[PDB]
Design a binder for this molecule. Sequence first.
Ligand SMILES: CCCCCCCCCCCCCCCCCC(=O)OC[C@H](COP(=O)([O-])OCC(O)COP(=O)([O-])OC[C@@H](COC(=O)CCCCCCCCCCCCCCCCC)OC(=O)CCCCCCCCCCCCCCCCC)OC(=O)CCCCCCCCCCCCCCCCC
Ligand SMILES: CCCCCCCCCCCCCCCCCC(=O)OC[C@H](COP(=O)([O-])OCC(O)COP(=O)([O-])OC[C@@H](COC(=O)CCCCCCCCCCCCCCCCC)OC(=O)CCCCCCCCCCCCCCCCC)OC(=O)CCCCCCCCCCCCCCCCC
Ligand SMILES: CCCCCCCCCCCCCCCCCC(=O)OC[C@H](COP(=O)([O-])OCC(O)COP(=O)([O-])OC[C@@H](COC(=O)CCCCCCCCCCCCCCCCC)OC(=O)CCCCCCCCCCCCCCCCC)OC(=O)CCCCCCCCCCCCCCCCC
Ligand SMILES: CCCCCCCCCCCCCCCCCC(=O)O[C@@H](COC(=O)CCCCCCCCCCCCCCC)COP(=O)(O)OCC[N+](C)(C)C
Ligand SMILES: CCCCCCCCCCCCCCCCCCCC(=O)O[C@H](COC(=O)CCCCCCCCCCCCCC)COP(=O)(O)OCCN
Ligand SMILES: CCCCCCCCCCCCCCCCCCCC(=O)O[C@H](COC(=O)CCCCCCCCCCCCCC)COP(=O)(O)OCCN
Ligand SMILES: CCCCCCCCCCCCCCCCCCCC(=O)O[C@H](COC(=O)CCCCCCCCCCCCCC)COP(=O)(O)OCCN
Ligand SMILES: CCCCCCCCCCCCCCCCCCCC(=O)O[C@H](COC(=O)CCCCCCCCCCCCCC)COP(=O)(O)OCCN
Lengths: 161, 82, 205, 375, 438, 111, 63
Amino acid sequence: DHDHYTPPKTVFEDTITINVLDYDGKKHAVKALIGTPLNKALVEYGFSSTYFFPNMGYYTQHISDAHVFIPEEYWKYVENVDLKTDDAEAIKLMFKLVVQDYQRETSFFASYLTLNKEMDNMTIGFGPIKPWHITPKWSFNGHHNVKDRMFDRLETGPFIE
Amino acid sequence: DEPKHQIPGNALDNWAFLRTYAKPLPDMIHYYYYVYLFGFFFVYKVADFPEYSPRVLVMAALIGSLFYVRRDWVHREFKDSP
Amino acid sequence: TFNYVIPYGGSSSYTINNEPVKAEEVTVDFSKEPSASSLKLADKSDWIAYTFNNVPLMATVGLLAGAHEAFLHYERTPIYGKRTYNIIKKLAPIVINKTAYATLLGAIFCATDALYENYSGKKSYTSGMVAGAATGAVFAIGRPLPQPLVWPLVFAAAPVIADLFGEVYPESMKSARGYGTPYGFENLDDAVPTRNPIRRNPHHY
Amino acid sequence: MWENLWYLDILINVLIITIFGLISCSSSATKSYDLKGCFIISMVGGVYDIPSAILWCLASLSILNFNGFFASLFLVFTWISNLFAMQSLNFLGIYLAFEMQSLCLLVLGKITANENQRWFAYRGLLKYLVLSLIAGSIFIFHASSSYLQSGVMISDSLVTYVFLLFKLGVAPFHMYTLELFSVVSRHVAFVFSTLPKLSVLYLISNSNIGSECVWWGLISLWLGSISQYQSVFVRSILLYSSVAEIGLVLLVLQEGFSWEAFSWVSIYFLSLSGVWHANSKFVSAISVASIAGLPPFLGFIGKAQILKSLVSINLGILIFSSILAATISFIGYLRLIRLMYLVSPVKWKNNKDSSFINWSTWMLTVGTLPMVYSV
Amino acid sequence: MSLYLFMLFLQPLSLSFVSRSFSKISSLMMSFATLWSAVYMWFTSNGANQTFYQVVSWGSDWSTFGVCYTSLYISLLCAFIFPICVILVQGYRALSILICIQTAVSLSIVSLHMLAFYALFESSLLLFFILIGRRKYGSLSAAYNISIYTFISALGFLISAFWLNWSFGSVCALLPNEEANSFVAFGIFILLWVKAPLVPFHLWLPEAHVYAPTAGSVLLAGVLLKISIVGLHVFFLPICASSIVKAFPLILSICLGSFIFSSFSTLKQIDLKKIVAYSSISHMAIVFLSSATNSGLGIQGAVLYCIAHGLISPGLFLLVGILYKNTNTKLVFYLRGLSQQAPVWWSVWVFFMLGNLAFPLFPNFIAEVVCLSALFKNHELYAYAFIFFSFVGTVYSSTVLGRLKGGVSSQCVDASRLDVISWNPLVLATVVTGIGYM
Amino acid sequence: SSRIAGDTTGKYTPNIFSPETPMDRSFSHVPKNPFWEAWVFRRDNIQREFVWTWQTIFDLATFVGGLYVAMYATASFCSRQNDKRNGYPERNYYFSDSKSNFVIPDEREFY
Amino acid sequence: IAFIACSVNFLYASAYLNDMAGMLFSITITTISACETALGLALCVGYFQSRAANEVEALNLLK
Ligand SMILES: CCCCCCCCCCCCCCCCCC(=O)OC[C@H](COP(=O)([O-])OCC(O)COP(=O)([O-])OC[C@@H](COC(=O)CCCCCCCCCCCCCCCCC)OC(=O)CCCCCCCCCCCCCCCCC)OC(=O)CCCCCCCCCCCCCCCCC
Ligand SMILES: CCCCCCCCCCCCCCCCCC(=O)OC[C@H](COP(=O)([O-])OCC(O)COP(=O)([O-])OC[C@@H](COC(=O)CCCCCCCCCCCCCCCCC)OC(=O)CCCCCCCCCCCCCCCCC)OC(=O)CCCCCCCCCCCCCCCCC
Ligand SMILES: CCCCCCCCCCCCCCCCCC(=O)OC[C@H](COP(=O)([O-])OCC(O)COP(=O)([O-])OC[C@@H](COC(=O)CCCCCCCCCCCCCCCCC)OC(=O)CCCCCCCCCCCCCCCCC)OC(=O)CCCCCCCCCCCCCCCCC
Ligand SMILES: CCCCCCCCCCCCCCCCCC(=O)O[C@@H](COC(=O)CCCCCCCCCCCCCCC)COP(=O)(O)OCC[N+](C)(C)C
Ligand SMILES: CCCCCCCCCCCCCCCCCCCC(=O)O[C@H](COC(=O)CCCCCCCCCCCCCC)COP(=O)(O)OCCN
Ligand SMILES: CCCCCCCCCCCCCCCCCCCC(=O)O[C@H](COC(=O)CCCCCCCCCCCCCC)COP(=O)(O)OCCN
Ligand SMILES: CCCCCCCCCCCCCCCCCCCC(=O)O[C@H](COC(=O)CCCCCCCCCCCCCC)COP(=O)(O)OCCN
Ligand SMILES: CCCCCCCCCCCCCCCCCCCC(=O)O[C@H](COC(=O)CCCCCCCCCCCCCC)COP(=O)(O)OCCN
């Protein structure tokens, strides 16, 4: 009994940087912690509210998702979803209403990928999104010209504008 | 760690199946226009229909419910081919 | 009774009868009687005639379903791109097959219902159950395991639901009035109407 | 000339308030409370009966939450259209009043959209417009054929029934409500999903515009309930609830139960006010419960009036459908309750503008016992 | 009666004005005051008034309240068992929800108007959805189950009440009305079918009980299941006796099937709470059948057995809650050596389990004897069927006790002073009823 | 390494910062098992492994339907015997097709 | 075009029956139709001015 305690690692040790290609085409180095979902890491960095959309699930709209392109090597770390459940209904709805034609075989949602040590120096890109609407407040006209941050939105998710 | 439900299927195969819903989406106005027009004409015609037995009506409702196809179903399976 | 010593409810004498008393002095009816068309369609005497009179409904429902599916397919196809294939050739089977299957199922249901009623000689729930079961059996000819049990049940149940709430319910609750004195209890001193209330004129649409 | 004066007074009142508001337009009073009060006083000159007094109450409550002279003027225009719809005696009154109301909806929807919200709002307004044009054109064409055949314009006809079916939004004529009300402001959707109904119900009840067919209400009840259960978005849940209920109400109103529909519309207005003008979780929960029909709230009385009317007509299919559809709707309302208090931490904007919202919540709680006589 | 109703209305009222730190003390004092008012109502109820001991009306048919034999026993049971629920619950939110649920339930029992009955019983619908679906220890599935089952059954009951109000013109129990309609009987019956769990409409109960707090489970089993017997005696048998006699072979089939299938299902349970829940479902069948016989022996037996269950099931649910607090487990497999480790908890557990098995010195024995006598009055086979299958309850209870009784355990998990205080009233009441002061 | 959290005198304080573990209610919790927890999960979520097979249909119909049929038949027999015993006319039961309207015996009448 | 057709039908009926009701309904159609068109065209212009660069046939919803 009484095995050796493992001291925790410092943040410097557990910070991984990901290169994220934005809509305008600039590359940003997004430092991220291992064990965090990609959506949260992207939100904290300071991307605009236009780059993210609520998860279109019965009870998941509070989460903010993004359309991302993942390199073939990191497909393993994406999370499996049961078709006969409602998580699949969420994903199908987001593909039908947000991604649409801009879909590619590499297209995935940030919430379903969790950052790990093996994802260091990974290059991801924001995938193009079509205009979408849920409520007048929660919508995307199609113009990526607002300079706010998704972090600065306190309201958790859509309900009634 | 906690016990979790087993998900049938491989991760990439399920995601590929989900990605077949990401197709050009038509506007719903086109469907609505036709439904409104035909529905108005249908309501006008319904006043002249013969009186049907309740049993026949219920059976027709059942058949219509069974034969109704959800819009998502056609959307996922639609192929632009012969 | 609201006591623990004697049985609740009551007993009514079978020998003693109460002579019927009219709800009102003058009765004005705003409910029209069944049309001659309704009786003609309802006549199950000749199975072939019964079937041919009642199939229009199934055909219409099949046509609506086929039109729906055909429109969904047509809407997606792109006008801007020229298509090698003919759209009507692709879409016509959808509508035709849906209409044919719906008409066939409704024909089976109507035929079996009329044939059983004639052979039995009585109007009964069983006729609807056996017609539904036969339709559900035809629906589930090649379907996997659960469906052969489920469809004969759902289809058999549907005429039961129609009979219970379309025929038995209204006839069972014809006497209840709602105005004047309760149907059973006319001794009680409640205001007696000269005429029944006419809440609406007989419909004509 | 004296009978004409009653009608003339409303016009004179509206014009003088309009020109006063135009002359006294300043940044210092963007919220023209004085004009809102003048408009409310003006609309008291059109109250002649109990339904007109309900029209006044609802219009005044709606006017309170509109900001600016322009929106309040267009609400007064909506009120005038609604008042004239109740008094319409032939096809011309019906067409004129309803199309004026459609114009007021198009303006109110257009002037309450931000620049960032124009893409979706203007699309939904255009789709509403085109569908309204189909409805109005089919109505007027059939009305012309009827006038030619009969020589007289009589408001007891299938043509008017189908048109008023479109206006109510039952059977397959409910899609305009879904498309338009999803993309517009919450207040505009609330005031135009409740107030217009009263005029149509009054017209139907007074002009004997009823049909023997029960298919349209049965369809609305089932479609609305199933679509409410399958809808991910909360605006769609609320929009489909109105479809289902107005389908049932249509079935009840055809059979002559005018009093119950006029009491229902008032309770539904009060119940919908707090859910639509969401600011507090508790107010929204009490509203959802009232729409659901839970017994401690006034919503129970409103639903009870309709259900009580249904048992009198003694149609079994309607009662069975009603029970199952109500259960399906209840699942959607439970979803709404789950979203607020059982899914995730909820943070909402501090829009502290609860004009009649506290009063409505109080009226929902307290009103059950006074109105128990009805049921 | 007026004092009881006033105290009932004051208990939710008191919370609005308390300091938010005195909430628990005030709630306990209010619960005891409501119990004392119920005792006063019993004192002011003369047996000379055979039909209704007391009837009060406050201006309308809806506000007509009255106490009968069934109502008196159930109201006293609710007032007796509420203090235990109060002490077991902590937090203003929890207290508010519990006090509102109790007020609604206690007002439903004394109501004599079907529409008022519906208004009061179903008011506590969202509160149970929120209580069973609490953030960490609750299940959304159980909340949805209970809520949907209640809504569908109560809506059917409401439709029947509306027809009776339209046809007769009143729906108050005090006005003698009889109906032979089968649709209306079915509408009233479906509520009873669901509320008192009867196969196949019993699925909502076990889920709710497992994921409810101990105060909630105690209230549910103790009195919420009994609300069916008040509806049967007060709102079903007076008006729809003809339909119960017409359908007696079907009623008997469904009740016996419920008793058998529930007993067999209890055998596959590994969770203590699920075992207690399925025992309740099995026990409800005898009460339902006995009342449906429409005989003096049956109505009295059903009410007596209901009181015995309302004294024995809260005890088992309380002991299970205490054990779970001590160990954070409800799996019988993890719990071993409880005899040696908790001699005081074990003694009370064994006593309550003996009570659940209807042994002679327990109220269950007398109640069962009366109910079986009523069944034997109907037919000898009816009684025999129920008597024979009672062994299944013994098999599951014996297996559970044996698994818990012995083994190796390294944890002393015994009741504290607070836990003994909470069960002492239940123990004394069980003993007193067992000796014949029913 | 341990300390007594409870104080009978009433001067109880939670030493959240104590190096030594408090002997609170959590001291007596039983250690769970990875395999037992998965067994519990599998037992509760047994609907996932449900499959409609002929054996399942056979077993369900034979025991559940079979018991229900036996119970209905017995109840019908007992009702028939009681009616014969009491001397009442054949009662109009729900599924019985009887050309008699008798349901509730008249208390005044002597059978 | 459709509204004009209906108004013409009303004018035809008024000539057939020697009645003024159709002429008044027809003037009402002219007024309401013009107001509806003006509002709809305003909405169309506003919709077109807000179009994002990606959108191609914004006006052609039925595509
Ligand atoms: C050329 C133009 C193309 C159009 C063609 C025609 C144009 C219209 C002309 C005239 C239109 C008027 C009449 C048409 C039907 C009225 C509906 C309507 O117009 O609304 C506008 C509607 C669109 O409105 P929307 O609001 O935008 O869409 C809402 C949905 O969420 C849409 O979203 P969704 O589609 O993705 O979701 C669908 C959802 C929507 O839900 C519904 O469809 C609800 C409808 C349910 C019943 C409707 C009332 C029935 C009463 C009929 C009254 C007559 C009979 C009288 C007595 C009957 C008593 C019931 O339902 C489903 O999930 C699929 C299941 C289908 C029904 C579900 C019930 C299953 C029960 C069967 C039990 C068997 C299972 C057992 C085994 C299960 C194992 C556990 O347009 C149409 O759908 C028209 C298409 C016409 C096809 C109808 C097929 C038969 C028609 C008559 C049969 C009656 C049953 C209705 C079935 C489906 C109707 C939708
Ligand atoms: C003070 C005395 C009041 C006692 C009685 C009131 C009657 C005398 C009116 C005296 C005024 C007091 C207002 C109280 C009632 C309002 C009614 C009314 O006024 O007209 C009725 C009265 C004659 O109509 P009627 O008595 O209804 O009978 C006609 C037929 O029987 C046909 O009409 P009907 O519809 O009543 O037919 C009988 C009906 C049976 O109908 C009934 O039984 C009605 C039940 C009463 C319910 C009351 C709630 C209604 C909400 C409206 C609230 C009032 C707003 C006040 C607006 C006007 C303010 C003055 O049978 C039916 O089946 C039809 C269905 C009726 C609707 C169903 C009822 C449900 C309503 C919704 C309840 C749902 C609950 C929601 C929330 C509840 C929470 C507790 O008209 C007048 O006497 C002249 C109107 C003059 C008003 C303004 C003119 C004065 C100022 C002139 C210049 C203004 C500019 C300067 C401004 C000055 C201030 C700055
Ligand atoms: C004259 C001399 C003076 C002597 C005094 C005599 C005066 C007589 C009465 C005056 C007493 C004051 C009345 C209280 C008003 C505010 C009460 C309140 O807000 O509740 C929570 C509040 C606790 O506040 P809090 O902890 O500080 O945090 C609340 C925050 O604001 C927000 O917190 P949150 O966002 O975290 O929400 C969490 C929520 C979890 O979320 C939910 O569960 C939502 C569920 C929706 C409603 C629940 C449905 C079921 C409710 C059944 C009704 C309960 C009684 C059952 C009896 C059956 C009656 C048919 O949990 C709760 O809020 C508490 C759960 C249980 C309380 C629900 C009962 C309240 C019903 C409606 C309240 C009245 C508001 C009217 C508004 C007026 C103007 C705005 O008050 C309480 O202590 C418990 C409720 C007391 C109920 C008595 C109120 C009467 C309602 C019964 C209806 C009968 C008709 C009315 C006639 C009454 C006598 C004439
Ligand atoms: C028997 C009655 C029961 C039946 C019900 C129907 C009958 C109605 C009876 C009572 C009606 C009471 C209506 C309650 C309205 C609540 C008052 C209100 O809305 O005040 C607003 C008024 O807001 C305005 O816009 C003022 C503009 C006009 C002010 C009033 C107009 C007065 C005109 C004369 C009315 C007299 C009637 C004329 C003759 C009958 C103030 O709220 P806000 O400042 O906007 O936000 C509140 C912020 N917070 C609460 C969070 C602090
Ligand atoms: C909600 C009701 C829907 C039924 C639910 C049953 C379970 C669904 C399974 C699908 C099976 C198809 C439906 C069969 C139910 C009918 C009962 C069969 C009894 C039977 O065959 O007798 C018939 C009369 O029963 C009758 O037809 C009238 C009996 C009324 C049905 C039972 C009413 C209460 C059931 C509700 C239980 C719980 C509700 C939850 C669904 C024959 O009569 P006959 O006149 O032809 O005599 C013969 C002279 N040729
Ligand atoms: C003339 C009409 C002809 C007949 C036509 C019939 C057509 C349909 C009628 C069905 C009406 C019954 C309404 C209950 C529907 C079942 C419950 C919905 C299933 C469901 O998934 O609910 C989830 C939880 O529900 C639960 O956990 C509840 C479990 C199941 C409830 C059991 C139902 C109560 C008892 C049933 C009958 C009892 C007596 C009948 C008289 C919540 O889903 P979500 O919130 O995540 O939504 C996300 C979208 N998937
Ligand atoms: C298959 C086994 C049956 C399952 C039920 C088992 C035990 C339930 C007994 C409940 C006790 C009182 C209820 C009264 C009757 C309900 C069921 C009795 C059996 C039954 O279905 O008889 C039917 C008549 O009942 C009717 O016509 C009404 C049937 C119930 C309607 C279903 C849903 C109604 C909901 C309405 C809500 C409120 C409406 C209020 C206006 C047909 O028997 P039959 O006499 O025609 O014999 C012809 C056969 N050859
Ligand atoms: C798809 C769903 C269903 C598919 C599978 C169903 C398979 C089950 C079929 C057999 C089930 C048991 C047999 C009972 C019904 C047999 C035939 C029914 C006809 C009938 O009533 O005959 C009576 C049977 O004896 C009786 O009165 C009952 C004798 C058997 C009861 C005792 C057997 C087991 C005891 C276990 C306890 C169960 C009952 C507890 C009270 C005696 O004829 P009759 O003289 O009454 O004349 C009445 C006019 N036909």
